[PDB]
Amino acid sequence: TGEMGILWEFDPIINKWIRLSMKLKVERKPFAEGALREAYHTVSLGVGTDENYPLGTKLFPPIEMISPISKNNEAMTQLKNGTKFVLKLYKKQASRELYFEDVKMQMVCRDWGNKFNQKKPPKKIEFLMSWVVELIDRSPSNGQPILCSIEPLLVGEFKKNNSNYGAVLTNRSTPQAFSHFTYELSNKQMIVVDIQGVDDLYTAPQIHTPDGKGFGLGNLGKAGINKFITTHKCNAVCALLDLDVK
Ligand SMILES: Nc1ncnc2c1ncn2[C@@H]1O[C@H](COP(=O)(O)OP(=O)(O)OP(=O)(O)O)[C@@H](O)[C@H]1O
Numbered sequence: 001t002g003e004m005g006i007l008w009e010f011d012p013i014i015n016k017w018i019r020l021s022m023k024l025k026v027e028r029k030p031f032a033e034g035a036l037r038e039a040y041h042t043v044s045l046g047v048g049t050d051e052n053y054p055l056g057t058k059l060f061p062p063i064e065m066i067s068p069i070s071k072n073n074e075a076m077t078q079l080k081n082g083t084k085f086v087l088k089l090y091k092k093q094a095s096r097e098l099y100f101e102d103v104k105m106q107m108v109c110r111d112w113g114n115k116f117n118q119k120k121p122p123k124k125i126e127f128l129m130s131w132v133v134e135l136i137d138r139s140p141s142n143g144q145p146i147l148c149s150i151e152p153l154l155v156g157e158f159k160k161n162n163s164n165y166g167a168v169l170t171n172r173s174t175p176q177a178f179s180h181f182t183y184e185l186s187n188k189q190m191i192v193v194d195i196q197g198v199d200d201l202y203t204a205p206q207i208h209t210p211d212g213k214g215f216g217l218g219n220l221g222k223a224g225i226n227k228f229i230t231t232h233k234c235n236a237v238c239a240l241l242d243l244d245v246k
């Protein structure tokens with residue numbers, strides 16, 4: 001039929017994780033890849049609760065960060081039986097903490113997207129949902145259990161607009177103005193880069209902060225922030241949004 005998984009959704013507004021179960025069927029070979037990961041077509045065979053699966057503490061995320069109730073979640077509708085979606089694995093290592101940190105990062109970016117839209121720019125944006133999944137049916141050699149992340153399938157022409165280290169790859173205005181927006185309105189505590197997806201539906205972003213801690217692998221601290229600065233040229237969207245040219 002398919003394999004079981006423990007599914008984790010993060011909800012920023014309560015600052016907690018929701019723990020569920022699902023069953024899934026994953027193609028054998030990847031359809032795409034980048035420098036970090038490989039992506040696999042997958043189909044959903046249903047979402048359920050985690051009651052059969054002892055949490056068994058030792059714990060990460062810790063008990064105080066987990067919601068005792070899970071009846072409200074996006075997974076129920078976005079990953080219902082029959083859905084096509086995408087599963088990602090890291091290229092040849094890693095860490096339990098890492099996967100949870102990537103999903104948390106994408107959720108933070110979704111919040112940034114809604115903040116940008118509230119300003120009424122000419123084009124509105126959206127980041128996809130992302131989820132952590134423990135592939136419990138698969139064998140552990142260093143005793144490491146198998147983990148991954150999953151997200152919806154984007155239909156259409158996928159394009160990368162900027163990288164995590166200073167490259168500007170297309171002419172569009174919206175993706176570069178959004179990056180600038182997050183740097184200025186966060187009081188330079190943070191910036192969102194690696195803006196990529198179909199039209200303005202984006203996924204797999206990267207965040208840099210000054211002290212370089214947190215937010216997984218592509219966080220290049222002060223060095224990444226500086227690279228974005230060097231190549232940025234503000235556009236009509238930067239201006240409509242009243243951002244500083246400096
Ligand atoms: N949700 C999605 N739907 C369709 N295709 C996708 C999706 N996510 C990723 N891809 C494709 O898979 C490729 C690799 O995925 P992803 O970008 O997450 O890996 P990566 O190694 O982190 O890349 P990057 O260097 O951009 O961080 C993407 O460039 C894109 O072609």
Ligand SMILES: [Mg+2]
Pocket residue numbers: 034160196204
């Ligand atoms: Mg990519």
Ligand SMILES: [Zn+2]
Pocket residue numbers: 176177180232233234235238243
């Ligand atoms: Zn600008």
